[PDB]
Amino acid sequence: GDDRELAILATAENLLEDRPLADISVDDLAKGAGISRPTFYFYFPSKEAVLLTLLDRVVNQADMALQTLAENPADTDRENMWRTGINVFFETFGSHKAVTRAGQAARATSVEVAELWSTFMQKWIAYTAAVIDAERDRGAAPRTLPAHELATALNLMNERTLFASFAGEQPSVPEARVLDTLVHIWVTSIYGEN
């Protein structure tokens, strides 16, 4: 039941490591999961619905990890505080590069994927802005850009830059250098008076 479902999901994750969703059939997923094709269809209406589940699970994992960090004060300087938050995404999405990458490609063709991504990006930007505003309220950060516009561009930079690194794009920051790169830009732009 649920473990034929977890098997379709594990199969899809495993196959997405080697080729795109376009190069994977429902039959590929069925065979890997040790089930027939009509049995696959009891669990998922399509291969696109398989990706959506996987992406949904990854995005919620990142989100829960961010909630956990938030509910636990966390004892260090401002630069390290930002580093820890960015690290959630670096580690969560870096542990699921194939799914995370397939989600981006699916955004153009799947309104549900686009909607799911858009929902979490809004949540993450809103929370980023709320922290910047808190930092501004305690007098730790100057009131420069609107917090929400600042949060939007910084989260969009991370989306694109971690994606480039994880996909091995030309150009891209080496994955062993990208965390430090993003933390620098976030801290100087959030605390920089100019």
- Return d(Cα 187, Cα 83) in angstroms, integer: 9
If binding is defined by CB under 6 A, does position 80 make contact with ligand O8B? no
Residue 144 touches which member of a copy of itself, ligand O8B, none, C-beta under 5-8 Å by kind: a copy of itself
Contact pattern for a copy of itself over residues 32 through 71, marking x by CB under 8 A: ----------------------------------------
| Angstrom distance (rounded) from CA 21 to CA 24 | 5
Whole-number Å distance between alpha carbons of 71 and 56: 22
Q: Is the Cβ of residue 40 or residue 89 nearer to ligand O8B in the bound state?
A: 89
155 near ligand O8B, judged by CB under 6 A: yes
Per rule CB under 8 A, is residue 167 in the interface with a copy of itself?
A: no
Query: Pick from 126, 176, 175: which is nearest to 154 by CA?
Result: 126
Report in angstroms how near the CB of residue 19 gets to ligand O8B at its nearest.
16
CB of 146 to a copy of itself, least distance (A): 8
Omega cis (within 30) before 171: yes
Contact 128, 151 (CB under 8 A): yes
Q: Tell whether residue 124 is a contact of ligand O8B (CB under 6 A).
A: yes
**Which residue from 161, 88, 159, 87 is spatially nearest to 118, judged by alpha carbons?**
159
Please list every residue from 162 through 181 that binds ligand O8B, using CB under 6 A.
Answer: 162-163, 166
Copy the structure tokens of residue 136.
Answer: 């501004």
Q: Pick left, alpha or beta for residue 104 (phi over 0 → left; psi -120 to 50 → alpha; otherwise beta).
A: alpha
Question: Count residues contacting ligand O8B (CB under 6 A)?
Answer: 18
Instruction: Determine the longest span between alpha carbons in the chain, in angstroms.
Output: 62
What 8-state DSSP symbol labels residue 22? G
The whole-angstrom separation of Cα 15 and Cα 125 is: 32
Of residues 88 through 147, those in contact with a copy of itself by CB under 8 A are: 105, 108, 118, 121-122, 125, 144-146
List residues near a copy of itself by CB under 8 A: 79, 105, 108, 118, 121-122, 125, 144-146, 149-150, 152-157, 159-161, 164, 169-174, 177-178, 180-182, 184-185, 187-189, 191-192, 194
Residues in contact with ligand O8B by the rule CB under 6 A: 82, 85-86, 89, 93, 100-101, 104, 124, 127-128, 131, 155, 158-159, 162-163, 166
